[PDB]
Amino acid sequence: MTGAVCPGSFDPVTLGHVDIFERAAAQFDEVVVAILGMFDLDERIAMVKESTTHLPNLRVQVGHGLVVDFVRSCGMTAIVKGLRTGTDFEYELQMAQMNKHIAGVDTFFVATAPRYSFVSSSLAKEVAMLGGDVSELLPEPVNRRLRDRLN
Amino acid sequence: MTGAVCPGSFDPVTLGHVDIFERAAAQFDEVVVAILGMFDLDERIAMVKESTTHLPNLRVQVGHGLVVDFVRSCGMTAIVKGLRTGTDFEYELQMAQMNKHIAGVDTFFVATAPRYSFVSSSLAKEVAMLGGDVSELLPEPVNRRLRDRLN
Amino acid sequence: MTGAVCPGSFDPVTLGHVDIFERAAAQFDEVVVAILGMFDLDERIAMVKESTTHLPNLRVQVGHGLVVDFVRSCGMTAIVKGLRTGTDFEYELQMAQMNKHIAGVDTFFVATAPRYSFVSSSLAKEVAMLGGDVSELLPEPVNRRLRDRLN
Amino acid sequence: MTGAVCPGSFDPVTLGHVDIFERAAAQFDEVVVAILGMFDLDERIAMVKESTTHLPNLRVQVGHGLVVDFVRSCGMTAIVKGLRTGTDFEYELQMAQMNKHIAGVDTFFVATAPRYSFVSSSLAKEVAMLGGDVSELLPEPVNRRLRDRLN
Amino acid sequence: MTGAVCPGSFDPVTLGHVDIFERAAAQFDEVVVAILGMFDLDERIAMVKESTTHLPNLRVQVGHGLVVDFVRSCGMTAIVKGLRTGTDFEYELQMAQMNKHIAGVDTFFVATAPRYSFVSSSLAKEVAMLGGDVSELLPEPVNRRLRDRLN
Amino acid sequence: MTGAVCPGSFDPVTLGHVDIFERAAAQFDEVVVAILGMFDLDERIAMVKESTTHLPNLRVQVGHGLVVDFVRSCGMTAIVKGLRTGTDFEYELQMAQMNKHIAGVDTFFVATAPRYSFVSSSLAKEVAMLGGDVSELLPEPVNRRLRDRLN
Ligand SMILES: O=C(O)c1cnn(-c2ccccc2)c1OCCCc1c[nH]c2ccccc12
Ligand SMILES: O=C(O)c1cnn(-c2ccccc2)c1OCCCc1c[nH]c2ccccc12
Ligand SMILES: O=C(O)c1cnn(-c2ccccc2)c1OCCCc1c[nH]c2ccccc12
Ligand SMILES: O=C(O)c1cnn(-c2ccccc2)c1OCCCc1c[nH]c2ccccc12
Ligand SMILES: O=C(O)c1cnn(-c2ccccc2)c1OCCCc1c[nH]c2ccccc12
Numbered sequence: 001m002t003g004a005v006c007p008g009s010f011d012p013v014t015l016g017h018v019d020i021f022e023r024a025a026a027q028f029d030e031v032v033v034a035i036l037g038m039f040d041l042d043e044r045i046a047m048v049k050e051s052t053t054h055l056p057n058l059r060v061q062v063g064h065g066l067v068v069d070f071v072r073s074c075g076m077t078a079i080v081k082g083l084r085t086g087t088d089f090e091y092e093l094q095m096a097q098m099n100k101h102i103a104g105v106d107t108f109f110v111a112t113a114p115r116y117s118f119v120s121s122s123l124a125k126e127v128a129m130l131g132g133d134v135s136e137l138l139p140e141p142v143n144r145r146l147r148d149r150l151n
Numbered sequence: 152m153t154g155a156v157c158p159g160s161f162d163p164v165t166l167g168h169v170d171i172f173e174r175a176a177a178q179f180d181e182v183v184v185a186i187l188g189m190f191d192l193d194e195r196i197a198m199v200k201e202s203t204t205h206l207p208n209l210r211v212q213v214g215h216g217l218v219v220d221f222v223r224s225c226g227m228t229a230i231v232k233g234l235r236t237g238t239d240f241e242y243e244l245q246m247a248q249m250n251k252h253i254a255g256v257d258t259f260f261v262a263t264a265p266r267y268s269f270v271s272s273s274l275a276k277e278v279a280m281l282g283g284d285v286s287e288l289l290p291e292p293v294n295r296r297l298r299d300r301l302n
Numbered sequence: 303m304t305g306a307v308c309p310g311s312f313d314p315v316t317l318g319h320v321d322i323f324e325r326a327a328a329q330f331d332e333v334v335v336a337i338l339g340m341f342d343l344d345e346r347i348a349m350v351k352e353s354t355t356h357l358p359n360l361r362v363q364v365g366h367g368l369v370v371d372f373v374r375s376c377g378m379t380a381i382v383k384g385l386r387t388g389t390d391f392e393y394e395l396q397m398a399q400m401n402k403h404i405a406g407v408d409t410f411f412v413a414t415a416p417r418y419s420f421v422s423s424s425l426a427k428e429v430a431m432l433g434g435d436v437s438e439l440l441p442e443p444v445n446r447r448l449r450d451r452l453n
Numbered sequence: 454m455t456g457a458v459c460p461g462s463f464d465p466v467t468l469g470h471v472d473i474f475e476r477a478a479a480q481f482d483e484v485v486v487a488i489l490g491m492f493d494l495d496e497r498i499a500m501v502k503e504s505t506t507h508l509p510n511l512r513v514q515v516g517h518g519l520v521v522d523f524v525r526s527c528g529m530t531a532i533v534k535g536l537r538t539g540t541d542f543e544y545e546l547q548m549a550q551m552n553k554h555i556a557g558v559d560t561f562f563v564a565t566a567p568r569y570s571f572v573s574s575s576l577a578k579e580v581a582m583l584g585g586d587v588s589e590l591l592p593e594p595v596n597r598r599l600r601d602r603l604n
Numbered sequence: 605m606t607g608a609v610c611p612g613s614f615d616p617v618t619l620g621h622v623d624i625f626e627r628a629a630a631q632f633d634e635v636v637v638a639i640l641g642m643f644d645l646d647e648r649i650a651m652v653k654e655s656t657t658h659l660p661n662l663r664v665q666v667g668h669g670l671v672v673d674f675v676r677s678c679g680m681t682a683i684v685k686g687l688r689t690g691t692d693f694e695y696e697l698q699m700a701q702m703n704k705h706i707a708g709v710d711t712f713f714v715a716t717a718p719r720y721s722f723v724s725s726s727l728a729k730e731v732a733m734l735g736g737d738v739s740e741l742l743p744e745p746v747n748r749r750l751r752d753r754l755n
Numbered sequence: 756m757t758g759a760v761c762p763g764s765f766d767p768v769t770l771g772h773v774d775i776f777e778r779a780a781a782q783f784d785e786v787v788v789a790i791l792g793m794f795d796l797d798e799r800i801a802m803v804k805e806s807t808t809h810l811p812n813l814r815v816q817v818g819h820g821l822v823v824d825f826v827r828s829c830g831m832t833a834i835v836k837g838l839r840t841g842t843d844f845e846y847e848l849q850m851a852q853m854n855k856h857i858a859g860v861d862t863f864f865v866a867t868a869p870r871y872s873f874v875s876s877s878l879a880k881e882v883a884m885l886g887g888d889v890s891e892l893l894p895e896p897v898n899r900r901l902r903d904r905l906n
């Protein structure tokens with residue numbers, strides 16, 4: 001049995017994140033989205049859940065402390081995340097090698113879909129709160145809350 | 152059922168490659184090493200086989216044409232390869248997105264072990280043929296053939 | 303009066319190139335595509351011409367020697383090209399600074415459209431000639447010739 | 454009619470910035486320097502104005518909110534900025550593609566002059582306030598204020 | 605007579621730092637570790653001293669202000685530091701060229717040992733304080749204090 | 756006693772190379788320029804010699820095989836080279852770590868002078884042979900031979 005943990009702050013979750021969730025869900029038996037700010041923990045969870053109803057083998061859970069302890073305790077087998085740029089890679093390479101060193105846990109990376117390469121939660125927030133239309137970059141459950149939260 | 156294809160020229164296979172094979176073999180049901188020069192096809196195959204006897208769910212096969220056609224025809228589910236540097240990533244990102252575009256096939260990357268980050272088949276060859284000791288960087292089945300081939 | 307030269311081998315021209323042509327044509331009075339292999343010079347020209355009929359202020363011309371001499375002789379005012387990655391940038395930065403040094407000619411770069419970030423003429427060719435469908439990445443005038451050329 | 458907006462914090466403006474202003478002013482009908490800390494808004498403006506008296510088609514203006522809204526409202530046609538490194542490019546590539554997505558506004562980049570590649574406002578400030586001579590990196594109107602401000 | 609200054613915050617010093625100290629000590633007559641937070645200045649000094657007893661030509665000293673003023677005042681001849689990634693290089697390249705500009709002081713870089721490429725003081729701290737075993741990445745004098753400090 | 760070897764093809768030597776020679780010569784007792792095409796070996800040597808008459812502790816020598824064997828045999832203590840970009844660094848990092856692995860020989864890097872960051876022997880040649888004035892980028896002994904060689 002295999003299991004991928006996808007860790008992050010998801011504040012908020014983007015269509016880029018969901019694309020990675022979908023791609024991890026097709027290769028692993030279970031996916032756990034581990035949520036480690038604009039939105040509360042509770043809202044971040046609902047946003048992820050409402051955006052992933054089409055993924056029966058995925059669940060969302062709050063995480064505390066080292067991602068590797070989360071992986072080992074819950075019997076998962078790998079960490080999975082997306083990479084957009086060579087700069088993403090150098091940063092994530094450090095964390096992955098450190099995680100391999102301390103716990104023997106492997107990290108698998110997948111390349112962003114080209115259409116979401118420029119998306120970050122932080123940029124989407126900064127733009128959305130200034131009137132920019134980032135609706136095509138985020139799941140509708142997130143768009144709802146941004147519209148409300150900003151009215 | 153899941154399956155990872157690890158494609159490359161493997162001329163020759165290195166301990167870095169084997170590390171990736173091992174890590175793919177722990178997450179996927181089968182691994183196929185697809186061999187796409189210093190050594191003949193036949194020798195490259197034996198070198199890979201002799202270096203992976205400890206991996207029962209791995210097999211070696213010659214590949215022709217697009218890696219994605221190999222993946223789809225044989226019912227495999229993903230391409231897996233290692234990345235050493237941000238420059239590896241930018242090059243492999245192009246191929247991965249192109250492969251996703253033409254065939255819907257996903258590529259999962261894993262970070263090199265730190266001790267092999269500077270290893271390439273080409274550099275190992277150029278150095279070995281000049282008297283440099285690269286034996287700690289390559290499997291013993293490869294070292295044997297380099298010693299012979301160079302006597 | 304302003305003029306941008308867009309230099310390259312265009313073997314063949316891609317939808318990524320055309321996107322840059324369009325964006326240069328909106329800021330400059332004239333655009334000259336300077337064509338500096340799979341296709342003949344004559345075919346490369348027709349492919350560019352047939353792909354740019356919607357750009358009245360753009361023309362195609364064969365180029366020989368330094369791009370800066372082409373710019374100065376024909377009274378153009380800048381070189382314009384696209385960038386996909388940080389690695390594109392470092393290479394093109396060298397040429398741009400050298401061109402500024404020898405001739406005082408400035409180069410303006412524009413970021414690729416995200417959907418074409420992984421496109422190169424060379425990769426498109428290698429894939430197309432192996433049966434891969436790259437038709438969505440190239441103008442129809444190019445697709446025609448690839449289909450013919452490969453039948 | 455064409456117009457380039459050059460946005461930034463300009464705290465303070467450097468000779469690198471001025472070089473880009475000059476190069477934008479030669480290709481566009483108007484340039485607007487949009488000023489979006491060590492110096493007040495008022496001082497930043499004077500410093501830019503006093504450093505650009507030789508550019509009749511350039512004006513300085515305070516900016517609020519999205520740069521793209523500034524461009525569209527004032528009938529400008531492009532954003533123009535400098536790039537020093539591949540790392541500058543990856544960061545600015547994200548903003549440029551986001552700006553293209555939300556507003557259709559294009560960004561043109563120009564490579565730094567080699568002599569200013571290591572210049573940043575932040576590094577110049579940190580060094581100047583410690584006695585280092587950064588006078589050759591900044592316009593005299595800025596040097597005046599640094600000398601005063603630091604006496 | 606030659607002298608290398610190795611500047612940094614060393615909070616705490618790592619085995620990666622010590623490797624660089626050793627390599628600088630073999631090429632220069634003297635090495636000065638200049639200490640410019642988790643640990644006090646006093647503790648940082650002891651940790652460096654206790655970790656370098658095997659280097660008779662190395663001494664540790666607190667630094668204030670520009671590293672170049674430290675180098676010139678004490679008659680040293682160069683700054684020496686390690687680089688892990690291309691991103692380290694671009695950042696350190698800026699500081700090195702600025703230091704050359706203001707004071708004529710040269711900086712020599714050495715590549716990290718592969719086994720420490722993923723090590724940073726900040727990552728080691730964050731992990732150690734969460735129960736992760738980073739003991740193989742740090743000198744025993746540092747490990748002692750982390751164990752104490754965290755009991 | 757210390758000694759730096761500066762290895763390369765020097766076809767031809769540039770002002771960027773000479774800047775590095777000068778900076779190595781100020782920190783090491785001897786510098787050996789090891790010459791490992793447009794110009795003959797004999798001419799490359801004369802060009803380097805004529806360009807370095809102001810460096811009494813520098814000599815030029817032809818090199819064969821591994822640079823590390825050259826260093827060890829002649830009792831030198833380090834390899835020294837310049838770096839222009841993060842991409843230079845990633846490539847040279849591989850060679851440096853391989854050289855450390857096989858022979859224990861360390862490599863020290865120095866950052867290019869900003870004014871020569873875009874200079875390469877290959878680009879200078881391609882441009883010079885097309886009429887471009889690269890004379891300010893190369894030593895006069897090289898300029899002489901390019902003028903002759905191209906008349
Ligand atoms: O960094 C962000 O805020 C942010 C928001 N969306 N995307 C994204 C954009 C395009 C594609 C995939 C995501 C981002 O890029 C960071 C990717 C790093 C990452 C960390 N944890 C993850 C878990 C799942 C997937 C990715 C990650
Ligand atoms: O490029 C090479 O010649 C070469 C030789 N060994 N290693 C290596 C060094 C360290 C770690 C993993 C490999 C290399 O790096 C390239 C990694 C790209 C790659 C392409 N196909 C693959 C299949 C399996 C694993 C990796 C790849
Ligand atoms: O390098 C290639 O073969 C190739 C084919 N298509 N694209 C592309 C992909 C996405 C976006 C814009 C182009 C490529 O990327 C290289 C971009 C460098 C460039 C040089 N000359 C140019 C003239 C106009 C536009 C770009 C360039
Ligand atoms: O980042 C800085 O503080 C800073 C100060 N000077 N220079 C500079 C150094 C060399 C060359 C051109 C500028 C900097 O580099 C950042 C370049 C990004 C940029 C953003 N907005 C701009 C508007 C006009 C021009 C550039 C920019
Ligand atoms: O950045 C850190 O916190 C940190 C902790 N250990 N290492 C390291 C990891 C591997 C190898 C050499 C160091 C780090 O990498 C930063 C290297 C930059 C550097 C600045 N000053 C220095 C003085 C001596 C040596 C290096 C530096």
Ligand SMILES: O=C(O)c1cnn(-c2ccccc2)c1OCCCc1c[nH]c2ccccc12
Binds near residue numbers: 771
């Ligand atoms: O690569 C080239 O052809 C080339 C020509 N000049 N410069 C240069 C440009 C700016 C600054 C220092 C050199 C080049 O950059 C490559 C630098 C790599 C290098 C290898 N061996 C060396 C020996 C001494 C110094 C450098 C090197």
